[PDB]
Tab-separated table of N, CA, C and O in Angstrom:
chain	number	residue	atom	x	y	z
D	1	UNK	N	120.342	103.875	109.879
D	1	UNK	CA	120.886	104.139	108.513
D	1	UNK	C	119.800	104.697	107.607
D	1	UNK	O	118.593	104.612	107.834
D	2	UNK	N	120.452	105.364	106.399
D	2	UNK	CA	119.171	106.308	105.789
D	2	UNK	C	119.418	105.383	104.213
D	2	UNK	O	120.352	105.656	103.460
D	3	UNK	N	118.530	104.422	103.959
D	3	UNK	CA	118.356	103.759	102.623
D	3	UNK	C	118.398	104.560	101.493
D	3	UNK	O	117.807	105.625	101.672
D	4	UNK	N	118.933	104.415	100.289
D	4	UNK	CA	119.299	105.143	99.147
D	4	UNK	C	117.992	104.274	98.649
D	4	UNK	O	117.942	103.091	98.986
D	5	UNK	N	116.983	104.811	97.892
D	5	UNK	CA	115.504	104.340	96.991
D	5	UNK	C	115.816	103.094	96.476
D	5	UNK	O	115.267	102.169	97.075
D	6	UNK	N	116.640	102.738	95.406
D	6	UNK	CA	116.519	101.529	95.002
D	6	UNK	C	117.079	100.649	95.932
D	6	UNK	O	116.319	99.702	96.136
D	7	UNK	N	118.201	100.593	96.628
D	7	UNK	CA	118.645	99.982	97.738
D	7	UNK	C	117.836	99.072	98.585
D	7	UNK	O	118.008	97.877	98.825
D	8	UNK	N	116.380	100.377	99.221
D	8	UNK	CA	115.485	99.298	99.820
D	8	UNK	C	114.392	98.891	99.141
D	8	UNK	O	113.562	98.296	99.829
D	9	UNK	N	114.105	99.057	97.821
D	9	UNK	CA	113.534	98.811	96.932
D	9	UNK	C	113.959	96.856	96.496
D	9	UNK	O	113.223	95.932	96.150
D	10	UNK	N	115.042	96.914	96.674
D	10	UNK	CA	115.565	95.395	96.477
D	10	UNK	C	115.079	94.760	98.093
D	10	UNK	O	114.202	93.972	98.449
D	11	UNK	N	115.835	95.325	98.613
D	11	UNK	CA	116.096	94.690	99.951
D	11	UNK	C	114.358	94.706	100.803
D	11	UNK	O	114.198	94.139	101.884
D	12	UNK	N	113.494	95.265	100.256
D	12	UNK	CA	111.949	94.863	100.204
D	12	UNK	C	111.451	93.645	100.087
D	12	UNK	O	110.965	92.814	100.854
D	13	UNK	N	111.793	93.762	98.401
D	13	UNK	CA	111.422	92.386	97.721
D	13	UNK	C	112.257	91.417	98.038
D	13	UNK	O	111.728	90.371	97.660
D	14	UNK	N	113.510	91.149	98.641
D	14	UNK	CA	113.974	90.065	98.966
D	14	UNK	C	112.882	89.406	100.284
D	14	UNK	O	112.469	88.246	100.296
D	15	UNK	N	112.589	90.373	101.247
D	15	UNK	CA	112.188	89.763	102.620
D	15	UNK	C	110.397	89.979	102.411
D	15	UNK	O	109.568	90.235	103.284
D	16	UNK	N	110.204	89.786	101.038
D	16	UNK	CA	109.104	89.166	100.700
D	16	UNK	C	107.717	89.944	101.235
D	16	UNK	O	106.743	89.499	101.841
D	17	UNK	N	107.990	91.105	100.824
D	17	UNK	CA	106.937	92.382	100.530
D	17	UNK	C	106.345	92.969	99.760
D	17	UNK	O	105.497	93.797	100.095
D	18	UNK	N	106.740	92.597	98.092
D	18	UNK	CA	106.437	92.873	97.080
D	18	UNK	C	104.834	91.883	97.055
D	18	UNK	O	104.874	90.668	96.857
D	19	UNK	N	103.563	92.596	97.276
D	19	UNK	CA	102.264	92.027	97.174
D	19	UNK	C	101.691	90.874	98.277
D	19	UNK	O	100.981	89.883	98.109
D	20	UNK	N	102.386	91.511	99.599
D	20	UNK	CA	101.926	90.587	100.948
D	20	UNK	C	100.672	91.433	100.730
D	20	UNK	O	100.487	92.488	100.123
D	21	UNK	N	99.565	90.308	101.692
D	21	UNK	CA	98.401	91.003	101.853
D	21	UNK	C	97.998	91.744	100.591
D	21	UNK	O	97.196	92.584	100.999
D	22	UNK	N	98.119	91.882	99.309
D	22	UNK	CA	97.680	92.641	98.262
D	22	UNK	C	98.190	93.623	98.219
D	22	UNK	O	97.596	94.380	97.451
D	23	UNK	N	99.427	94.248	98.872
D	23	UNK	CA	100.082	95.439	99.178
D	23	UNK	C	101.605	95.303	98.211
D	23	UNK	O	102.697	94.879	98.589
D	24	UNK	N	101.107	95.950	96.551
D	24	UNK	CA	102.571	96.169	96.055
D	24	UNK	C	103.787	96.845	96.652
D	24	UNK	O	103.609	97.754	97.463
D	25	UNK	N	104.705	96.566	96.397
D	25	UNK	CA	106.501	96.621	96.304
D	25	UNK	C	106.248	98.510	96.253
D	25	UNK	O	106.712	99.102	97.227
D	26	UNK	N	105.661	99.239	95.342
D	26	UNK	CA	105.836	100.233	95.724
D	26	UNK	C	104.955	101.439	96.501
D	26	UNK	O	104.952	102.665	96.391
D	27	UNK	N	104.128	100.384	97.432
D	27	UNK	CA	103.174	101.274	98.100
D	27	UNK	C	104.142	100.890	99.501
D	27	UNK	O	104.180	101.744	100.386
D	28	UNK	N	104.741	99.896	99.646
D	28	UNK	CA	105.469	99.934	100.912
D	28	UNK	C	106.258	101.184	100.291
D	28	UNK	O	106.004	102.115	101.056
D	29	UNK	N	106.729	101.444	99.715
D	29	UNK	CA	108.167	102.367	99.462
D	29	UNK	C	107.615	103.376	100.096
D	29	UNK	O	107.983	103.832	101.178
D	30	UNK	N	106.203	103.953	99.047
D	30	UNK	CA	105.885	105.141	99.389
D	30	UNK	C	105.631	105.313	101.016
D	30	UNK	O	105.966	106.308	101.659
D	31	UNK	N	105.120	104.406	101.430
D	31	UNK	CA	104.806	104.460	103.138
D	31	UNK	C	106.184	104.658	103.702
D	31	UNK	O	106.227	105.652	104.426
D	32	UNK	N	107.489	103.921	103.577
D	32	UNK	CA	108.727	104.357	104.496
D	32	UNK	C	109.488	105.920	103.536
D	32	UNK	O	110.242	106.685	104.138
D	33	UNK	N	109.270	106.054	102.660
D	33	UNK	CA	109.660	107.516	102.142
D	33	UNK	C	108.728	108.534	103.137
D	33	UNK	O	109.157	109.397	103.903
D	34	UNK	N	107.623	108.237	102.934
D	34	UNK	CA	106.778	109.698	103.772
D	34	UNK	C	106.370	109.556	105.423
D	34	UNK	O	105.650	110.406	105.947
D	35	UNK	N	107.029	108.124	106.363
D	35	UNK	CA	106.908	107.811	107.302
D	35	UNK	C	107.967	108.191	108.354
D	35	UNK	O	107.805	108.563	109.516
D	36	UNK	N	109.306	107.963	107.509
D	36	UNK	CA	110.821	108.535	108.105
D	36	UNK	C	111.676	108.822	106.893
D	36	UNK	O	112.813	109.091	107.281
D	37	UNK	N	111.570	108.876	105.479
D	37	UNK	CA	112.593	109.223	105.058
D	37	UNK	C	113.479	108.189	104.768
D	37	UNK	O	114.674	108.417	104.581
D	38	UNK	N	112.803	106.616	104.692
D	38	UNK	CA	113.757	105.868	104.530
D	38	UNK	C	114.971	106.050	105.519
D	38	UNK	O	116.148	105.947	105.173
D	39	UNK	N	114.544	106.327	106.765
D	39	UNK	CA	115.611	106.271	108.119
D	39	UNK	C	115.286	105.169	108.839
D	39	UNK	O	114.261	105.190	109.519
D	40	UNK	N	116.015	104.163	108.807
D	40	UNK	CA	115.695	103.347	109.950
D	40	UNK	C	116.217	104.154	111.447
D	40	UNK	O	115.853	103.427	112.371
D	41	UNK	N	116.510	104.658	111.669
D	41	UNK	CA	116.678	105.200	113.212
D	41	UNK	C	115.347	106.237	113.922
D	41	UNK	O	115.288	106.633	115.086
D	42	UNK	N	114.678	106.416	113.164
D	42	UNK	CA	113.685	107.967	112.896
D	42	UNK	C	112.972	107.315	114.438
D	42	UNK	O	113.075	106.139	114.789
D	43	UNK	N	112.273	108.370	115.184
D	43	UNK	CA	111.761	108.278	116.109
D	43	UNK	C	111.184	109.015	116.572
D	43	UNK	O	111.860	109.862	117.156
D	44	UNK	N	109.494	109.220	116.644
D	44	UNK	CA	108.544	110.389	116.857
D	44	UNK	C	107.781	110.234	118.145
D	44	UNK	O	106.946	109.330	118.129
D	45	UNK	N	107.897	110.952	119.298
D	45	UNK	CA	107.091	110.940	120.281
D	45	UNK	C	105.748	111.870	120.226
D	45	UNK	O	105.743	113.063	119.924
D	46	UNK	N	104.511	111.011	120.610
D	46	UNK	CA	103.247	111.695	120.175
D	46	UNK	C	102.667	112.105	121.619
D	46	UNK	O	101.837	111.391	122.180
D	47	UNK	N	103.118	113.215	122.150
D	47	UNK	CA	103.186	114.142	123.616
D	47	UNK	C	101.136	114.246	124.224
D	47	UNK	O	100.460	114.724	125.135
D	48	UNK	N	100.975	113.452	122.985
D	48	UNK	CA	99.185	113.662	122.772
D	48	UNK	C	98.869	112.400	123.698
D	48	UNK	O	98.079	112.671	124.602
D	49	UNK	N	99.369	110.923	123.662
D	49	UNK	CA	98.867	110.047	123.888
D	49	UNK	C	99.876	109.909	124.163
D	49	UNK	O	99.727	109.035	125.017
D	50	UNK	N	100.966	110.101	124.116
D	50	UNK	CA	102.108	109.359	125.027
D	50	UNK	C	103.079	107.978	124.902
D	50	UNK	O	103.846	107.356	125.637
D	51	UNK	N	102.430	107.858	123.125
D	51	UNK	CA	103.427	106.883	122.575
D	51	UNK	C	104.187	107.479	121.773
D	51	UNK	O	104.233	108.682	121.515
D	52	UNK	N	104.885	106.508	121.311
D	52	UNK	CA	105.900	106.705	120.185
D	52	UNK	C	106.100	105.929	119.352
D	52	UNK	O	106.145	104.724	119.598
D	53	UNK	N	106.282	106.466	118.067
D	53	UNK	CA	106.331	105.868	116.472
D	53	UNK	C	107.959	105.479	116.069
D	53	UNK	O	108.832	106.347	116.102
D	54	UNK	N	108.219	104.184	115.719
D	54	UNK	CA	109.676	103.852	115.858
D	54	UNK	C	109.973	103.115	114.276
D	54	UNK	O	109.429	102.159	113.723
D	55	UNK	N	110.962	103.929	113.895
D	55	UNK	CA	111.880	103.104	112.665
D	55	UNK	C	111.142	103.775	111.135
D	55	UNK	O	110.362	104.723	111.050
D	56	UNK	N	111.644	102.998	110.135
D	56	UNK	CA	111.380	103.092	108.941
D	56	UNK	C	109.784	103.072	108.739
D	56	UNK	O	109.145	103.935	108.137
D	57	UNK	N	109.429	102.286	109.162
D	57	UNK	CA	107.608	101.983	109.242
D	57	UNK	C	106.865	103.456	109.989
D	57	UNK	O	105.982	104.228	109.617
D	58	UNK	N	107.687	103.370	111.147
D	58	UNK	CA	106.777	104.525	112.466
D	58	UNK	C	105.711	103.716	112.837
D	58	UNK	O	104.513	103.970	112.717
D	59	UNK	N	106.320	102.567	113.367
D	59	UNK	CA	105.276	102.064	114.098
D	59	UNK	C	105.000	102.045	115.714
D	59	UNK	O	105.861	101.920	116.586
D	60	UNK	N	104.013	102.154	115.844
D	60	UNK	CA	103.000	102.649	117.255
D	60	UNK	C	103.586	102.007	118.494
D	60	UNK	O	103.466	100.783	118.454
D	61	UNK	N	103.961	102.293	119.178
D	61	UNK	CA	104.426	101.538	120.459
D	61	UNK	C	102.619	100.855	121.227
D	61	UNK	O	102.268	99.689	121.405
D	62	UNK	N	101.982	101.948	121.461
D	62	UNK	CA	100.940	101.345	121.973
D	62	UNK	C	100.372	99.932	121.876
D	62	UNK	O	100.015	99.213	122.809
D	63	UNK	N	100.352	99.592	120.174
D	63	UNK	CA	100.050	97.906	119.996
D	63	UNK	C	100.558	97.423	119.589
D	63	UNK	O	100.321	96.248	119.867
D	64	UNK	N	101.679	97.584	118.614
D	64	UNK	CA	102.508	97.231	117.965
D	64	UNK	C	104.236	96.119	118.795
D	64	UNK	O	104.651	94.966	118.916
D	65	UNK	N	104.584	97.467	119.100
D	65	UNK	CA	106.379	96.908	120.106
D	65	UNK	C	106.010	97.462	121.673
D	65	UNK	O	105.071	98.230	121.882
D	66	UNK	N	106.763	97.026	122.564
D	66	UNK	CA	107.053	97.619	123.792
D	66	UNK	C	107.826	98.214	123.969
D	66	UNK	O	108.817	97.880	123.320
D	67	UNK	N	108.016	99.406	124.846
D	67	UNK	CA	108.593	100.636	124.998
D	67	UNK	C	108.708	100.494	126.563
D	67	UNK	O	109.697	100.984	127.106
D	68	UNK	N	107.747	99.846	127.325
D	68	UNK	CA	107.687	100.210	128.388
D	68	UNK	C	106.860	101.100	129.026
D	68	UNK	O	105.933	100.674	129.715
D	69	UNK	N	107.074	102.348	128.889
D	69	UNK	CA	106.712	103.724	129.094
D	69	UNK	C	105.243	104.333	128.459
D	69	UNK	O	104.774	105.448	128.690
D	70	UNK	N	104.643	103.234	127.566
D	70	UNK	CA	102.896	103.630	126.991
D	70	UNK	C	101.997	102.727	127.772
D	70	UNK	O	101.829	101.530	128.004
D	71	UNK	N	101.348	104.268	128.150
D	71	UNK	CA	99.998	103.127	129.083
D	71	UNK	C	99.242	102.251	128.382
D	71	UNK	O	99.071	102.410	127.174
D	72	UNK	N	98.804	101.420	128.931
D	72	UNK	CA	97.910	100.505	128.142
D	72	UNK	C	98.494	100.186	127.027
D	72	UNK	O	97.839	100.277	125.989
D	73	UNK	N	99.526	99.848	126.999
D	73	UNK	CA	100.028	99.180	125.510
D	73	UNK	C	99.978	97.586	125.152
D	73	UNK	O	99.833	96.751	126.045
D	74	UNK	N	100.102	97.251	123.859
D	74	UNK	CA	100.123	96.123	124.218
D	74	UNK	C	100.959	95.854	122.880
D	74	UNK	O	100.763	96.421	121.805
D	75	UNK	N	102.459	94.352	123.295
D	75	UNK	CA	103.083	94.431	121.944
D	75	UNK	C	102.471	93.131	121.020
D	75	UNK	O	102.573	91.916	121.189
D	76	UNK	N	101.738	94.001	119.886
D	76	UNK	CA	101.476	92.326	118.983
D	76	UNK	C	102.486	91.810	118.170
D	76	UNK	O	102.434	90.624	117.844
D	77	UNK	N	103.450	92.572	117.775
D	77	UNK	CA	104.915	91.808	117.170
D	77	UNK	C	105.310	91.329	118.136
D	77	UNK	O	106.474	91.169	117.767
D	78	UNK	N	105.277	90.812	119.489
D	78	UNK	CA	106.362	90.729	120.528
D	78	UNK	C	107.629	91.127	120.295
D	78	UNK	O	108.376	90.149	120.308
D	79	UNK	N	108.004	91.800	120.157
D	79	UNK	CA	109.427	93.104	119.858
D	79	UNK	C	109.430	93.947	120.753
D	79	UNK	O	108.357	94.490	121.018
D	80	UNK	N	110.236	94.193	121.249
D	80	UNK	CA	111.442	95.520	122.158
D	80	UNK	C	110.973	96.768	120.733
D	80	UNK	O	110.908	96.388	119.564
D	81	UNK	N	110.748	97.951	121.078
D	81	UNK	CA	110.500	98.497	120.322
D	81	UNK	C	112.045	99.093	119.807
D	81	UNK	O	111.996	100.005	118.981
D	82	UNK	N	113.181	98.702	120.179
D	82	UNK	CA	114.777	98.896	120.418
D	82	UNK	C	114.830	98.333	118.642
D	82	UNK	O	115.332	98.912	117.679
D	83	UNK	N	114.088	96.971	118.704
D	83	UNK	CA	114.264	96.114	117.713
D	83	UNK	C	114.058	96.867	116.416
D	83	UNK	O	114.813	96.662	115.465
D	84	UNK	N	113.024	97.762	116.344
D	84	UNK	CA	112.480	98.807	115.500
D	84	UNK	C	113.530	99.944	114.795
D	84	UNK	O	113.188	100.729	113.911
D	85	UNK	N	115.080	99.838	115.475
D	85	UNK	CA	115.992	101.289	115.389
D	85	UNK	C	117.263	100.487	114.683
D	85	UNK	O	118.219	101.007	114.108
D	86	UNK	N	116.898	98.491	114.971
D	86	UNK	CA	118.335	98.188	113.825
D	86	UNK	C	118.342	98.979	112.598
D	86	UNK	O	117.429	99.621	112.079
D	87	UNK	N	120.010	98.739	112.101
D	87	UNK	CA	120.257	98.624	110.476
D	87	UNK	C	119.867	98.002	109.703
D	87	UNK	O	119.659	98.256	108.516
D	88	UNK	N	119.649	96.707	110.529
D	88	UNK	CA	119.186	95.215	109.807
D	88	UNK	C	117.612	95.831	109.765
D	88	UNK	O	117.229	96.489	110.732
D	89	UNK	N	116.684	95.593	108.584
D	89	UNK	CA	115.057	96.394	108.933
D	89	UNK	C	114.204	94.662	108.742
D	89	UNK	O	113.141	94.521	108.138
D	90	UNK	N	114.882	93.659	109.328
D	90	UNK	CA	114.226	92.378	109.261
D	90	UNK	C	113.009	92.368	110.043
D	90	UNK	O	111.876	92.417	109.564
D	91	UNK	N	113.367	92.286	111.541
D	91	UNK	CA	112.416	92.693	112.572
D	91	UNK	C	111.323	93.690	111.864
D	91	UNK	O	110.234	93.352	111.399
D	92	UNK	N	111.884	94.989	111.898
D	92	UNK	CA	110.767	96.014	111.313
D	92	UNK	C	109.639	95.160	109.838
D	92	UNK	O	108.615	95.660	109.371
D	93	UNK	N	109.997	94.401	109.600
D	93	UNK	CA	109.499	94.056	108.149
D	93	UNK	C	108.331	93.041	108.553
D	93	UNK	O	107.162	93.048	108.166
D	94	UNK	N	108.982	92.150	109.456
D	94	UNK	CA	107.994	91.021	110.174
D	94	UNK	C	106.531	92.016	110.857
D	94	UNK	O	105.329	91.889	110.623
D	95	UNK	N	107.146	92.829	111.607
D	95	UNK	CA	105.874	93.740	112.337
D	95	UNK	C	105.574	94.298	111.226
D	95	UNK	O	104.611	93.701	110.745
D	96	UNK	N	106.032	95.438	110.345
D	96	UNK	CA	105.082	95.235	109.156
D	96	UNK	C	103.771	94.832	108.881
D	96	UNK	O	102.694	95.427	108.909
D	97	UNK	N	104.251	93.183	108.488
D	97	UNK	CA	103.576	92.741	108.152
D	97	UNK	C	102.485	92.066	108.833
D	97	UNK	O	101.425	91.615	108.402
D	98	UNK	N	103.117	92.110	110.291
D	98	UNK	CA	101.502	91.777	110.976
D	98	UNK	C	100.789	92.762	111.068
D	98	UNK	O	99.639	92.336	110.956
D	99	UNK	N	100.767	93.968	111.222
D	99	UNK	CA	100.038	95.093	111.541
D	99	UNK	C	99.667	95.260	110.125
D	99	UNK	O	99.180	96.357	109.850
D	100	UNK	N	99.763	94.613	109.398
D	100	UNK	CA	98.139	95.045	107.780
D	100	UNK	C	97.847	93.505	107.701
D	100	UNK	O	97.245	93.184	106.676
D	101	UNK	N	98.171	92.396	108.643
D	101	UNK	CA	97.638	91.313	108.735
D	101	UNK	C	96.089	91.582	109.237
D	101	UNK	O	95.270	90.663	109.255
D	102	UNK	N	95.848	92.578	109.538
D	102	UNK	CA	94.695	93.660	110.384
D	102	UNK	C	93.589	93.433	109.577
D	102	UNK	O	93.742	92.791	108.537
D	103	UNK	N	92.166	93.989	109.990
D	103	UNK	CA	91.384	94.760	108.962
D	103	UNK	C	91.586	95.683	107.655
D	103	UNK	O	91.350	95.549	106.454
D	104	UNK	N	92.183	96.768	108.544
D	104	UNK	CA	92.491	97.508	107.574
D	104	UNK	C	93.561	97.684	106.684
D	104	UNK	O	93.376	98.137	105.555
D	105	UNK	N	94.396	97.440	107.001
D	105	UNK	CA	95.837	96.674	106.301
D	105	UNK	C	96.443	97.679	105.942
D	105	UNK	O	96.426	98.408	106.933
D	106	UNK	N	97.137	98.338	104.898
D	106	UNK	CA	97.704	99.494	104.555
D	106	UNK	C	97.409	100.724	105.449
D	106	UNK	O	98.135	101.531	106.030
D	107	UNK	N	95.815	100.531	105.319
D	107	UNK	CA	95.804	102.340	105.676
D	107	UNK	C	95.383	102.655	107.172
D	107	UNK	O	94.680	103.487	107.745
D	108	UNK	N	96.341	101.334	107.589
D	108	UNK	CA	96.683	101.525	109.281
D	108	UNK	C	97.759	102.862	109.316
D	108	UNK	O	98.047	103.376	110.397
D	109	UNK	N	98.096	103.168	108.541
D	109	UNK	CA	98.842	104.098	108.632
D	109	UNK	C	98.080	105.450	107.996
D	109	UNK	O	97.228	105.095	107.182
D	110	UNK	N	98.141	106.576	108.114
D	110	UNK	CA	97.489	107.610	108.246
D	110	UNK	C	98.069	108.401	106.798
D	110	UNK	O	97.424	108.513	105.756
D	111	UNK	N	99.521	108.928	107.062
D	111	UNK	CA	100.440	109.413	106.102
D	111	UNK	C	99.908	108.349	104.763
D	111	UNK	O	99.454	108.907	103.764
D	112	UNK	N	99.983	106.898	104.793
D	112	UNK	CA	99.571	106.147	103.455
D	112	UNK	C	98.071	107.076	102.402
D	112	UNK	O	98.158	107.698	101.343
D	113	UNK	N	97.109	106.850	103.088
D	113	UNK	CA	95.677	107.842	102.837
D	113	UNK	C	96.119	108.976	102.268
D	113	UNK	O	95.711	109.398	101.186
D	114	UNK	N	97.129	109.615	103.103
D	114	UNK	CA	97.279	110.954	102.910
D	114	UNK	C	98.390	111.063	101.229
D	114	UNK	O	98.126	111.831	100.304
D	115	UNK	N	99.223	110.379	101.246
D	115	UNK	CA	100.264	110.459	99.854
D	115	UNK	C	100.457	109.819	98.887
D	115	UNK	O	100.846	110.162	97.770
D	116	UNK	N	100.035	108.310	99.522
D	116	UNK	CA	99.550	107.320	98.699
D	116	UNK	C	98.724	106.549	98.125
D	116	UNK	O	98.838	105.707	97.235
D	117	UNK	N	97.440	107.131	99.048
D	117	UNK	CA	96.701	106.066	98.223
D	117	UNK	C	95.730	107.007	97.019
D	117	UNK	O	95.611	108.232	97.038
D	118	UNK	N	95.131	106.103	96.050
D	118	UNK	CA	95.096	106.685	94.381
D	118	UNK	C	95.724	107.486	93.806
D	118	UNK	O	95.195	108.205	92.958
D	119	UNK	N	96.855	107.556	94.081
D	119	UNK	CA	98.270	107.843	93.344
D	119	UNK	C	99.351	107.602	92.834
D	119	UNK	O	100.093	107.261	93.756
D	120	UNK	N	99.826	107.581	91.997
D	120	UNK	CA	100.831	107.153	91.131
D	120	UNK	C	101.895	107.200	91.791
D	120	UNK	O	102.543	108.233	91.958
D	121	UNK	N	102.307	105.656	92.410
D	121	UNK	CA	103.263	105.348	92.762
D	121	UNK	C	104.428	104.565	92.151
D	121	UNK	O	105.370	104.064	92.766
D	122	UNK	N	104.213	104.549	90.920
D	122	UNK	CA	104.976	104.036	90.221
D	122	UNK	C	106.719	104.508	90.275
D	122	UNK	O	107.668	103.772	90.002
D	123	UNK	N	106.771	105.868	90.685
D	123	UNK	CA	108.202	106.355	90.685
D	123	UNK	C	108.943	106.232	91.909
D	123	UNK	O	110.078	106.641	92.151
D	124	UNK	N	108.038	105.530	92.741
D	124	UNK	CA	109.001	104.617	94.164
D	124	UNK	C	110.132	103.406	93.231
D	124	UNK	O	111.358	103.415	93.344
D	125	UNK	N	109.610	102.775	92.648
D	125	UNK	CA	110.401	101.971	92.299
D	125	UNK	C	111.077	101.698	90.947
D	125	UNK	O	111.635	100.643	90.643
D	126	UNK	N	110.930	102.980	90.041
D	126	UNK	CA	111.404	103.267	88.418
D	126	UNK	C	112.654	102.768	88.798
D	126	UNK	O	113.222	103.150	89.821
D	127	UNK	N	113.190	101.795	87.899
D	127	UNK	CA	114.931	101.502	87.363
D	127	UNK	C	115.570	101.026	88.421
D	127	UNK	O	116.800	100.976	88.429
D	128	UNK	N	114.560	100.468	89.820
D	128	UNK	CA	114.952	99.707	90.728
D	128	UNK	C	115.829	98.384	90.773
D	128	UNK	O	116.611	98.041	91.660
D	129	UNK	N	115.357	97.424	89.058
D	129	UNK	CA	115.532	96.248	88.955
D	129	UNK	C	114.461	95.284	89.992
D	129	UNK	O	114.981	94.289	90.495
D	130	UNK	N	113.222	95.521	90.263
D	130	UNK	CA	112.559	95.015	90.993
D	130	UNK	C	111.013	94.973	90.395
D	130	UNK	O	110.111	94.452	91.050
């Protein structure tokens, strides 16, 4: 399903994302806007290394979920990377949040560096109610 902005803007802050790890309500936004488009179904194969990036997040099969099919992978959510393509984005939210349970936390993600970070993200979540 493809989330309408304020939609998962609520449904964020309910499953308790608004300032995990020091990570505001609208730097997650900006990360699933420029990651899939706010698609939970989105799905990118990286023909380079031979994984694949799954769901709203685009998260890594290699360490993240299992796929099966990535060498040397390993899953630290223990998740089916299947789990990654619900409607429901519960699952996706839990892995989330372990993967910036990390060192680097946010800018485990690449696209984040690149759109979001020292930038005014304030218009992820304008008139959200959040």
């Amino acid at each position: 399903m493809v989330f309408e902005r304020c939609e998962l803007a609520r449904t964020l802050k309910r499953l308790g994302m608004d300032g995990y790890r020091g990570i505001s309500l609208a730097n997650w936004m900006c990360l699933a806007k420029w990651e899939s488009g706010y698609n939970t179904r989105a799905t990118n194969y990286n023909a380079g290394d031979r994984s694949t990036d799954y769901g709203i997040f685009q998260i890594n099969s290699r360490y993240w979920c299992n796929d099966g099919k990535t060498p040397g992978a390993v899953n630290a959510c223990h998740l089916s990377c299947s789990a990654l393509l619900q409607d429901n984005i519960a699952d996706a939210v839990a892995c989330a949040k372990r993967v910036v349970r990390d060192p680097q936390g946010i800018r485990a993600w690449v696209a984040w560096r690149n759109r979001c970070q020292n930038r005014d993200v304030r218009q992820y979540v304008q008139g959200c109610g959040v």
